[PDB]
Design a protein around this nucleic acid. Structure first.
Lengths: 223, 159, 148, 58, 51, 50, 185
RNA sequence: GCCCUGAAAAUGGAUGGCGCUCAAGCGUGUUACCUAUACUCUACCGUCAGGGUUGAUAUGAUGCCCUGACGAGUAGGCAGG
RNA sequence: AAAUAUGUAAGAAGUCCUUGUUACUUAAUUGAACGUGGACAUUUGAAUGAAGAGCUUUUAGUGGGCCAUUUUUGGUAAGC
RNA sequence: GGAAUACUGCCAGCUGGGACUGAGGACUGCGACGUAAGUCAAGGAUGCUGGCAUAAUGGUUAUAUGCCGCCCGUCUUGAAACACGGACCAAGGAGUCUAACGUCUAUGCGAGUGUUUGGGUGUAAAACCCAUACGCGUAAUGAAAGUGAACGUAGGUUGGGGCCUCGCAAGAGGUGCACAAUCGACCGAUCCUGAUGUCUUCGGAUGGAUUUGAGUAAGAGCAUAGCUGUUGGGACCCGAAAG
């Protein structure tokens, strides 16, 4: 009894040591993955140019969507879509994997949201600052990797950076990973919307619809 | 006053197709129907017996009975806030195997087979359909295709 | 008791439970069974199919209990022998000393045939038996004796 | 006084509170309206196969 | 009892994700790219600057 | 008026019934009387049996 | 605001405790909620809940009904559990041994069971013998056998029983009940 | 395009008012700034949910404790007071 | 001959092999139904979500409605 | 030709100023820095100094000042309404009780159940006790005369909680009450079949049917009480012209 604890204690201390080391290996490898994908794309473009060709980039596999209309007066069809995408509150936001079956959802909803292509930076900070997970309904702040592993370990994914990676690379458990992430609760943008009126399209002078890369600037000020 | 007979509102619905009036070709009488088959109902107004009421035009149900000259069909109809189960006795002139149950059965076979060659190779399968995906990077060349540049065009009347 | 009564809980809401528009008025729709063939017919067919109209023969001065004939199923029957004396007859099971059972004494008027009885013979005195009832008694090696 | 005559207004809101669900699907459904001869013979078919299943239990 | 934000507060930054330690130590949130000379081809500039 | 799915009652009170209600509060009293009478009959009945 | 998808502040529709104030029942409950919580054992969870049920949902289990269940293959030695009361039934003659744990035995049922060499146990007694419900057979009465339920779902063509107070030809047997009198049902 | 004519009604009077003419007017562009019971973070009240805990050990087991989410309301239903 | 709306399907209640029952059916153990026995569970057969799913009884109020965009009928029109 | 700068973006780059908060209450957790012992900003504030006593401060109240604020009750799609009631204040003032019921619940007993018409008894309208009956239930179906519930371990199929067996687990097999769906069997009605018999017109075996029933298929009820709901009653309170 007086002894035993040291068994189980130094056990887990050791177990922890190893878990931590794995995350260290992994996180260092994702740094590489990323660093060389990005570099790759850059050189691709310069080579095409050099060959008198044009590199044309892969279409985005991933979007972040933020609902920007409040909740009254909404037509039933977009209303359902807004809910199936977990957007039932103004300024709350989620990740959507882009395919045809989801792209037609974003179309139905376009007047009520602002969306785009999030950067690693933005995703990293969304998940660090406002990442909470769903665990028997309850909404739980991701404040230790143990919590992620305990629910997402079964798919690989045993750190918060494992999570970010399954989000940014989309990839095989994106469904399950992304769903575990509660809807992000953003503030109003600090510095404003930058347009006199939100409820027109970004193309028309602003807010609503796909603003593409410019989602990062907006989300960063909301986060 | 108002008028709501049985074939009310059906002038274009029960009409025959342009240049397709007359005898119905024998294929229609040679199809075989089984309990559990999925048929689409579509009235032929040249055959007045065994005729679906117009609510069922364009609807698809399941065969629940087979008879000398008709199949019985089960349709689920919405009345109020609830579907009621309806059974219809349609003659065969008014019915047609549902073509999508055919793609489906074909794929189930295709699926069994894909599974077979995969196991008798001991490899992963992947049998469910993915939706259309984003599109991967390409390099377009310019050999013979130096971009032609266009500009908007001045207004002009052609009247 | 009144203190558990929604009428106490309604004090201070205008109007008790009864609505602003519809009021609790003083008999709409008529009294009692008014308009059962008129404005109350939907409730009356559905809920009371059969209600209106005649069916059958009248019978003047009928005397219930000319018809008295309360039924007992084989199913029980052994219940008419009292609990203690019951084990012995069951075990003995003989044609020579088998138990009388005056079913009329017990208050019954006919022995119907639902149920099984154990093999043991029984002498059943009754007025009226069903065809099958008598058939099961006999298979167990008892008889029916008609009495009055 | 004349009053309003008809409308559907609100009716789908109302049907969708508790509403729509779907059919109530069973394996072994109602044989209601199925060919009487056929059924009468199905009976005998089923009796027999039951018989034999029990025959294969000695 | 209190959500601390790893994006301020290096302690919980280090708690979730080490690596950060090396990330910072090695810089690499900066970090010079290599250097290539590759030139665009004639045609690319002809048409950039076209009409 | 007829509503809901309920049995059809036939409560016969269309008639001034309140002028003929008999509540037997005398249940206990009449009993004490019945006995006191039985007592004194037997009394004067000498040793006869009632 | 929030576009709510589901009723807020909805309460599970389930009893959480018996509506009864019988001290003893509360004690059986207090026992079982310890058991339910502290052991795995599906059994106690089931028995826990059944303790909360109202009278209509504890129909009685009869002694012939136990006789029958005991004839299940491999069941003869199980101890049969009735979270409610067991009633006598003069209809079986041969009744077997076993041990029945119930909330209540009618006098005849105790007799019957006992006379055949068996035993009557209360639920706490069943608890000590079987903290995990080992070798038990939970039995339930026929609930839809009740008179009330004859009249549910009453309507045209439903096959149900009217709420009639008094029966014979002359009571609800004419128009709407036979083809010869208006329509039929 | 702006502006002018076309352009008539009854108490005195309304770009909301003052007043404004390279506007404080009309078209367009760019920044900053003000501000809701909304959004973000935190405390507290309640409601609902999930979870732990009388195992021997003072004072509430319909209790104590942990955790997440939620809160508009006539007619009207139920609950706790 | 659109657009918007609209029916069905996307599998374990499935698939395949073997061969049992019948009074139906066939020239015909031929079909039709329903089955025994045998094989196939990682993506088991698109997506997204699920704040749990299914079910029963009983009962209140209501049963004058009105407004906006869009479709639209009568009317010169109407805050019709 | 070689640079610079702008623009846009990234840094787990370093720093200054200001504002609100400081929930929790021994210790348990994840870490960080140390060669180390130790230290720490790591599962929610501490430390140092000062100020106040017929006082600092807080509650209340009156008044001023900024901004805001139409009369309630009612019917109504719409009332502050140039709709109605209401000058003021006390006291009074409207869903009751009864007969019979539906659902739900609690309770007693349970194939039964209901002592209270009555009797016994009494510390006297109480409490205590009880014989025969009767009511409802345990049989249904027919207009009726009538007839009246096991082919089968009270049947077959599919789901079923729980339990049993193998297994370290995942799992697999066994058994499967309640409940649901479906095929069958049994009782009555209807329509067929019409045997052995008999007095010749009685009898009605046996086997059937897209027919039919508020049935059977190892009983649930009877009674007391409560909320809600139903019908008759002055029937939530107040009101005709009339007869």
């Amino acid at each position: 009894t007086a002894e035993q604890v040291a068994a189980e204690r130094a056990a887990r201390k050791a177990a922890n040591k190893e878990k931590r080391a794995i995350i260290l290996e992994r996180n260092a490898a994702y740094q590489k993955e990323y660093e060389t994908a990005e570099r790759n794309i850059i050189q691709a473009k310069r080579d095409a140019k050099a060959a008198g060709s044009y590199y044309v980039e892969a279409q985005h596999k991933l979007v972040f969507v933020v609902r920007i209309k409040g909740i009254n007066k909404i037509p039933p069809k977009p209303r359902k879509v807004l809910q199936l995408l977990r957007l039932t509150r103004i300024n709350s936001g989620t990740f959507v994997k882009v395919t045809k079956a989801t792209l037609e959802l974003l179309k139905l909803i376009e007047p009520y949201v602002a969306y785009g292509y999030p950067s690693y930076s933005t995703i990293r900070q969304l998940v660090y600052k406002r990442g909470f997970g769903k665990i028997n309904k309850q909404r739980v702040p991701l404040s230790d990797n143990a919590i992620i592993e305990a629910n997402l370990g079964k798919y690989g994914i045993l750190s918060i950076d494992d999570l970010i990676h399954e989000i940014i690379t989309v990839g095989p458990h994106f469904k399950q990973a992304n769903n575990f992430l509660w809807p992000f609760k953003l503030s109003n943008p600090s510095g404003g919307w930058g347009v006199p009126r939100k409820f027109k399209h970004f193309i028309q002078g602003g807010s609503f619809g796909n603003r593409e890369e410019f989602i990062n600037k907006l989300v960063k000020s909301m986060n | 006053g108002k008028s709501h007979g049985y074939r009310s509102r059906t002038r274009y619905m029960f009409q025959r197709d342009f240049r397709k009036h007359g005898a119905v070709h024998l294929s229609t009488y040679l199809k075989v129907y089984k309990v559990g088959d999925i048929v689409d109902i579509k009235a032929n107004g040249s055959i007045q017996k065994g005729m679906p009421h117009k609510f069922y035009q364009g609807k698809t149900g399941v065969v629940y009975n087979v008879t000398k000259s008709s199949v019985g069909v089960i349709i689920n109809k919405m009345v109020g806030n609830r579907y009621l189960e309806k059974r219809l006795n349609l003659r065969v002139e008014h019915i047609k195997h549902s073509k999508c149950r055919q793609e489906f059965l074909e794929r189930v076979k295709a699926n069994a087979a894909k599974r077979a060659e995969a196991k008798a190779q001991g490899v992963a399968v992947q049998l469910k359909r993915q939706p259309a995906q984003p599109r991967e990077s390409r390099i377009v060349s310019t050999e013979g295709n130096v971009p032609q540049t266009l500009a908007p065009v001045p207004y002009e009347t052609f009247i | 008791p009144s203190r558990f009564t929604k009428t106490r809980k309604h004090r201070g809401h205008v109007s008790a439970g009864k609505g602003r528009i519809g009021k609790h008025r003083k008999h709409p729709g008529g009294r009692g069974m008014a308009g059962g063939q008129h404005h109350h017919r939907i409730n009356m067919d559905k809920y009371h199919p059969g209600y209106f109209g005649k069916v059958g023969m009248r019978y003047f001065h009928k005397q219930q209990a000319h018809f008295w004939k309360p039924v007992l199923n084989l199913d029980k029957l052994w219940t008419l022998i009292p609990e203690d004396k019951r084990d012995q007859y069951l075990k003995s099971a003989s044609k020579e000393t088998a138990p009388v059972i005056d079913t009329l004494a017990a208050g019954y008027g006919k022995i119907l045939g639902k149920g099984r009885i154990p093999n043991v013979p029984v002498i059943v005195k009754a007025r009226f038996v069903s065809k099958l009832a008598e058939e099961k008694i006999r298979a167990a090696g008892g008889v029916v004796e008609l009495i009055a | 006084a004349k009053s309003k005559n008809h409308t559907a207004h609100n009716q789908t809101r109302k049907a969708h509170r508790n509403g729509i669900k779907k059919p109530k699907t069973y394996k072994y459904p109602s044989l209601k309206g199925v060919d009487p001869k056929f059924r009468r013979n199905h009976k005998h078919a089923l009796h027999g196969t039951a018989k034999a299943l029990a025959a294969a239990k000695k | 009892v209190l959500k601390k934000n790893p994006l301020k507060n290096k302690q919980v930054l280090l708690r979730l994700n080490p690596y950060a330690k090396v990330f910072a130590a090695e810089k690499l949130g900066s970090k010079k790219a290599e250097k290539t000379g590759t030139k665009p081809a004639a045609v690319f500039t002809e048409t950039l600057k076209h009409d | 008026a007829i509503s809901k799915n309920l049995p059809i009652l036939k409560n016969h009170f269309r008639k001034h019934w309140q002028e003929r209600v008999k509540v037997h509060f005398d249940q206990a009293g009449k009993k004490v009387s019945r006995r006191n009478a039985r007592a004194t009959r037997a009394a004067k009945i000498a040793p006869r049996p009632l | 605001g929030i576009d709510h998808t589901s009723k807020q502040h909805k309460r599970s529709g389930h009893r959480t405790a018996p509506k009864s104030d019988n001290v003893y029942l509360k004690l059986l409950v207090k026992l079982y909620t310890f058991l339910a919580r502290r052991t795995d054992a599906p059994f106690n969870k089931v028995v826990l809940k059944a303790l909360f049920l109202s009278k209509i949902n504890r129909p009685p289990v009869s002694v012939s009904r136990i006789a029958r269940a005991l004839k299940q293959e491999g069941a003869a030695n199980k101890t049969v559990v009735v979270v409610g009361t067991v009633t006598d039934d003069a209809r079986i003659f041969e009744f077997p041994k076993t041990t029945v744990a119930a909330l209540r035995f009618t006098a005849g049922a105790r007799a019957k069971i006992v006379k055949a060499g068996g035993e009557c146990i209360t639920l706490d007694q069943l608890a000590v013998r079987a903290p995990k419900g080992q070798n038990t057979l939970i039995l339930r009465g026929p609930r839809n056998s009740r008179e009330a339920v004859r009249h549910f779902g009453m309507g045209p063509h439903k096959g149900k029983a009217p709420r009639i107070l008094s029966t014979g030809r002359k009571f609800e047997r004419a128009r709407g009940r036979r083809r010869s009198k208006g329509f039929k049902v």
